[PDB]
Design a protein around this ligand. Structure first.
Ligand SMILES: Nc1nc2c(ncn2[C@@H]2O[C@H](COP(=O)(O)OP(=O)(O)O)[C@@H](O)[C@H]2O)c(=O)[nH]1
Ligand SMILES: [Mg+2]
Ligand SMILES: [Mg+2]
Ligand SMILES: [Mg+2]
Length: 161
């Protein structure tokens, strides 16, 4: 079964490590850089290899090997902080530079602390670079399992086409 690499991108403090923890175990706490999980979508089984930055985005020392050979990139931003959504342009630039033809997904984390703005992605990038957007909350787990399931489904469908 194929192994598809999914990287977590975004600024420091949006909830990338919390999403990574939720992936490994459905846990929230107020290890390794990558974790593999097996999904079956219809006929095809795929192993999603989710990567976390390891806190290296705090010193802006995310190496180019983090983006290389990435089948997908999840741009995570906090729904209560509008700067985290504005700063995604640099991360998308690095992704495209080191891994073109990569599926870009958008994650709006901390949906329990928004009630800020960022209600419209407003075509952050064109030519349908964004495959789909998601609103998650690592504290309550809302929309996380659905997000990863839909990501696996979309990339199985894309690799079959
Ligand atoms: N309420 C709420 N808090 C969150 C959520 N995700 C993360 N946090 C909080 O944000 C803090 C830092 O998040 P962190 O995992 O370090 O994000 P990262 O460093 O960007 O990967 C943690 O202490 C969490 O308690 C969420 O979905 N909802
Ligand atoms: Mg982190
Ligand atoms: Mg970085
Ligand atoms: Mg800031």
């Amino acid at each position: 079964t194929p192994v598809l690499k999914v990287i977590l991108c975004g600024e420091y403090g949006v909830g990338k490590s919390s999403l990574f923890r939720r992936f490994i175990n459905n846990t929230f706490v107020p290890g390794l850089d990558h974790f593999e999980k097996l999904y079956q979508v219809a006929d095809k089984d795929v192993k999603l290899q989710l990567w976390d930055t390891g806190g290296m985005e705090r010193i802006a020392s995310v190496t180019s090997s983090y983006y290389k050979f990435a089948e997908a990139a999840i741009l995570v931003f906090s729904l209560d902080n509008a700067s985290s959504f504005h700063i995604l342009s640099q991360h998308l630039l690095e992704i495209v530079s080191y891994a073109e033809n990569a599926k870009i997904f958008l994650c709006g984390n901390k949906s329990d602390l928004e009630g800020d703005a960022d209600i419209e992605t407003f075509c952050e990038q064109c030519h349908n670079l964004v495959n789909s957007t998601y609103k998650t909350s690592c504290k309550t787990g809302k929309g996380i399992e659905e997000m990863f399931a839909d990501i696996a489904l979309q990339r199985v469908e894309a690799n079959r086409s």
